[PDB]
Structure formats: structure tokens, C-alpha cells
Amino acid sequence: SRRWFHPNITGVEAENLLLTRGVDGSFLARPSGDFTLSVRRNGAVTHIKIQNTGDYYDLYGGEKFATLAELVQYYMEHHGQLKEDVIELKYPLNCADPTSERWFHGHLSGKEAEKLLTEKGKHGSFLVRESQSHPGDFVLSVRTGDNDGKSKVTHVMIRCQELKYDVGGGERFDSLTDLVEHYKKNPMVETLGTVLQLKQPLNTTRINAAEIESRVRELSKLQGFWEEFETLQQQECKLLYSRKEGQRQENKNKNRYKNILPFDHTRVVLHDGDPNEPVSDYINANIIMPEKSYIATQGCLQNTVNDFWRMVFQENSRVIVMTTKEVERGKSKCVKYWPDEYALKEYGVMRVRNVKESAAHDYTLRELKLSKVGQGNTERTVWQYHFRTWPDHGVPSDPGGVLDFLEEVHHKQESIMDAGPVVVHCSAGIGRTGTFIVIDILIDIIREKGVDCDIDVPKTIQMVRSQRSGMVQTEAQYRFIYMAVQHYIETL
Numbered sequence: 001s002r003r004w005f006h007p008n009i010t011g012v013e014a015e016n017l018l019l020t021r022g023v024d025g026s027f028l029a030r031p032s033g034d035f036t037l038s039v040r041r042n043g044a045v046t047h048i049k050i051q052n053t054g055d056y057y058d059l060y061g062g063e064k065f066a067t068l069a070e071l072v073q074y075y076m077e078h079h080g081q082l083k084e085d086v087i088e089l090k091y092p093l094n095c096a097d098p099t100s101e102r103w104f105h106g107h108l109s110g111k112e113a114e115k116l117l118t119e120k121g122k123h124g125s126f127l128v129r130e131s132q133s134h135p136g137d138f139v140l141s142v143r144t145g146d147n148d149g150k151s152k153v154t155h156v157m158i159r160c161q162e163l164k165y166d167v168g169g170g171e172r173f174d175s176l177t178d179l180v181e182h183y184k185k186n187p188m189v190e191t192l193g194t195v196l197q198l199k200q201p202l203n204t205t206r207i208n209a210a211e212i213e214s215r216v217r218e219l220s221k222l223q224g225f226w227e228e229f230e231t232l233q234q235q236e237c238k239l240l241y242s243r244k245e246g247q248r249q250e251n252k253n254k255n256r257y258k259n260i261l262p263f264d265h266t267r268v269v270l271h272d273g274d275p276n277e278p279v280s281d282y283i284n285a286n287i288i289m290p291e292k293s294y295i296a297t298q299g300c301l302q303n304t305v306n307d308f309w310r311m312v313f314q315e316n317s318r319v320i321v322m323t324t325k326e327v328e329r330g331k332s333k334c335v336k337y338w339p340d341e342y343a344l345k346e347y348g349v350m351r352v353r354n355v356k357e358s359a360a361h362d363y364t365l366r367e368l369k370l371s372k373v374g375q376g377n378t379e380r381t382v383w384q385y386h387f388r389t390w391p392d393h394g395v396p397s398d399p400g401g402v403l404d405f406l407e408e409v410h411h412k413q414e415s416i417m418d419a420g421p422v423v424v425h426c427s428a429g430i431g432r433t434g435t436f437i438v439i440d441i442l443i444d445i446i447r448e449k450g451v452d453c454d455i456d457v458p459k460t461i462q463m464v465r466s467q468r469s470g471m472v473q474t475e476a477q478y479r480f481i482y483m484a485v486q487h488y489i490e491t492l
């Protein structure tokens with residue numbers, strides 16, 4: 001449900017909430033790109049800092065995580081010993097705000113809402129807005145139907161009385177979300193039969209590509225970007241798919257970050273593994289396919305370089321995108337899994353030759369030759385695109401170089417008949433990596449359909465996040481994906 005996240009409270013409001021409405025074990029998370037976990041223990045409120053500069057959520061005195069929901073789930077089911085004394089996350093302190101619900105539109109007239117539902121709704125599309133006739137109340141607007149008169153818009157008053165909500169009779173809810181949830185499971189039936197089924201929120205995030213700059217300006221006033229992003233973050237609770245294989249003891253040492261793991265149902269499975277190793281089928285990587293496909297994976301560790309090259313070989317991948325230096329801020333992010341220029345190396349049963357490096361402003365290109373040892377004729381060229389100028393924290397101020405990069409990469413991939421997924425990695429393989437993949441997916445739509453096409457940035461991000469945890473980490477990357485797509489639209 002993710003209700004333990006309060007998008008707009010203060011520290012003192014968080015302590016007050018935990019001391020007066022929580023008990024020991026009660027907790028909540030809140031933003032300050034930094035966040036805080038606030039936890040009551042022994043009648044006192046502690047605040048634990050979470051940092052995310054773009055690769056993962058770094059929790060002080062804890063582990064690193066792909067999403068806040070996975071962070072909370074870990075410390076609520078595994079012990080994870082969040083210590084400091086031990087800090088236990090027992091009871092979510094739920095937030096009642098509706099401001100990051102997909103169906104909440106706050107300020108919105110009835111005629112604007114009828115038009116929105118008319119132009120872009122279907123039977124069951126709905127939304128909730130602030131009542132204008134009755135200050136303080138709210139309105140639920142639903143579309144139902146099959147301009148032939150076969151459809152209609154129905155409005156329903158939501159009374160707000162003593163901070164509780166109701167539709168004029170029956171139960172009174174502590175939040176608009178509790179009311180919507182309730183009347184989603186138990187639809188409202190009009191007198192003459194029509195059941196007001198709340199099937200899906202009206203989609204407002206989808207735009208036509210030509211109007212990108214207009215939306216980017218809309219999102220840049222008072223900020224709209226943060227609202228839209230945090231409404232996406234609110235959807236991360238639906239993506240807690242199992243990641244059992246990555247948690248196996250034999251696979252623990254193959255994870256760069258212990259708790260950042262691939263979903264079981266999209267992970268890359270490696271076959272033809274030597275039968276000597278009990279578990280030879282595992283790597284930290286997920287197939288990403290827009291629903292050109294991709295593999296999103298972490299930066300190699302010394303002990304997974306051989307498994308990485310089994311992946312590349314097995315999937316017929318011909319292009320690798322690296323978006324990290326080998327070492328950043330003095331810390332290892334990816335071991336050097338390719339040979340020096342002109343050299344030849346064996347990695348297990350795989351052999352790689354670095355044929356030639358080419359240096360451009362933002363990136364180096366390494367032309368690798370990959371084959372299986374003892375089996376001539378399996379050789380194929382793999383092109384390694386190594387973006388080197390990405391900032392250690394945050395994102396670039398201008399998307400130009402990233403776009404020139406992705407364009408080259410796309411043309412290489414397209415030029416190779418029956419090439420496999422493009423491999424993309426950074427350190428953890430979710431933040432820079434998801435940003436680059438999402439940008440590439442959006443640009444691909446436009447490449448094929450021109451500027452006269454529909455794009456939906458959060459929808460695409462959600463779709464990539466169902467295939468690997470936390471794809472796209474921060475609001476800064478979110479804005480950067482917009483800004484990149486804008487700049488691509490204006491170069492055509």
C-alpha cells in the first residue's frame with residue numbers, strides 16, 4: 001500500500017504523529033534527493049537518513065536498496081537488524097494525503113473534468129477533485145458506457161466532515177483513499193441500474209510528442225515534476241515480485257549489493273554451466289523488453305566476469321552500454337571485464353579480444369571479439385560503448401552527449417542482423433541503467449512514428465520497473481529523461 005510514506009510533512013510533524021498516534025514500533029518515511037525513516041522506539045523518535053544520488057537508496061546504519069518499498073519490506077520481514085540498541089519497524093503510520101494517488105486532481109472544475117473524461121476516458125475511467133460548488137467537499141467523476149449518447153459522465157459528492165469522508169450515506173472513511181478503495185471493491189449502483197465501476201484512473205500523463213516542451217513547461221511551474229514523479233513512486237508497492245534466486249546462499253556472492261536483486265520472473269538464466277558448480281545458472285541481470293530488447297545488469301565483480309561473458313554469448317548480444325567509470329569516488333563500481341586494447345584474454349570457456357578502441361568526447365568504443373574456447377566459428381563482434389563523463393552524483397546538465405551516444409548505439413544495434421538484447425549496466429544496474437534504457441525506449445517510439453505520436457513517461461517507467469526493481473532512481477533522472485526526449489524532438 002506504501003501508506004507509510006508522507007510526501008509533505010516536517011520532521012516535527014513526523015515526531016508529533018509518531019508520539020501521539022503511533023506506539024513503539026511505529027515508523028514512517030518522508031522526503032527532506034534525500035529521505036528520512038522516522039521510527040518510534042522506547043517512547044523516543046529516531047530519524048534515520050536515506051541518501052540516493054542516482055544508484056540506490058543508501059540507508060544510514062542499514063543496507064542499500066532498489067526502492068523504499070523493498071527497504072521497508074526487508075526490515076519488516078527479515079530482521080536486517082536496523083540498529084543504532086536495535087530499531088524495529090513494526091507498525092506503519094499511515095498517511096491520509098491523496099496527493100500522489102493516480103486518480104487525485106485537486107484543483108479541477110466539473111467542466112474541465114467532464115472534458116478530460118470525454119476526450120481520454122473509457123468505461124470505468126474516474127478521478128477525484130476538490131468540490132467548487134461546496135468548498136471543502138470533493139467530487140468523484142466517473143465515465144461509463146460502451147458522441148452517440150452510449151456513454152456518460154456521472155459525478156458524486158464526497159462530503160468531508162470532521163476529517164472523514166462519505167458519499168452522503170453509509171460509512172465514513174479516514175481518507176479519500178479508503179473511500180475510493182472501498183467503492184472500487186463494492187461499486188456504487190444508481191437507481192436505474194448503471195453501476196459506477198471505478199476501473200482505472202483517467203490517464204493524464206500521456207502526451208503527444210510534439211507538445212513535449214509545453215508539458216515540460218507545465219511540469220516546471222509550482223514543482224509539478226515532483227508531484228508526477230512521487231505519484232509514480234507511489235506505484236512501486238505493486239512491484240514487489242519475488243527475488244528468491246538471488247537470495248540463495250550459492251548466489252549471495254554474485255550480487256554487488258546484497259539486497260538489490262533481479263526478479264525471478266525476468267532474470268537471465270544461464271545454461272550450459274559446468275556441472276561442477278551446484279548453481280551455475282545465476283547472474284544479477286533482467287531481460288527488459290518494451291511491451292529492441294535489453295538486459296539490465298550490475299557492474300561485474302571479479303567473481304562474475306566469467307558469468308557476464310556467458311550471458312553475452314548465450315543471448316547473442318552484440319552491443320554493451322557501460323554508464324559508469326570503473327572507480328568513482330575511490331570506490332569500485334565495475335571490474336574491468338574486457339582486455340586492454342589489442343590483447344586477448346580467456347574468461348572461463350569464453351575468449352575475448354579487444355580489436356580496437358575509439359575515443360570520442362563523452363565515451364570510448366571498444367570493438368571486442370567474443371568466442372567460445374575450443375569452438376571456432378562461434379566468434380562474433382561485441383561493441384562496447386563506454387560512457388565516461390556521467391557525473392558522480394546527479395545527472396548531466398545537458399542531454400546532448402547522452403543523445404549522441406544513444407544514437408550511435410542504436411545505429412550499431414540496427415546494423416547487426418538478428419542481434420540479441422543490448423546489454424546495459426552501471427554499478428547496481430537500476431539507476432543510470434534504467435534512465436538510459438527508458439530514454440532509448442521513448443526515442444524509439446518517436447524514431448519509428450515521428451513527432452506525431454503519443455508518449456507516456458511514467459507509464460513506460462512503471463513498465464520497465466515491473467521487469468527490474470527500481471529502474472530509474474531519482475526525480476533528477478526523471479526530469480532528465482523528459483529533458484532528453486524534449487531535446488531529441490527539437491533536433492529533428
Ligand SMILES: CC1(N)CCN(c2cnc3c(Sc4ccccc4Cl)n[nH]c3n2)CC1
Pocket residue numbers: 099100101102103104105106203204205227228229230231232233235456458459462
Ligand atoms: C494530477 C495528478 N495528481 C494525478 C494524475 N497524474 C499521474 C498519473 N499517473 C501517474 C503515475 S503511474 C502511471 C501513469 C500512467 C500509466 C500507468 C501508471 Cl501506473 N505516477 N505518477 C502519476 N501521476 C499526475 C498528477
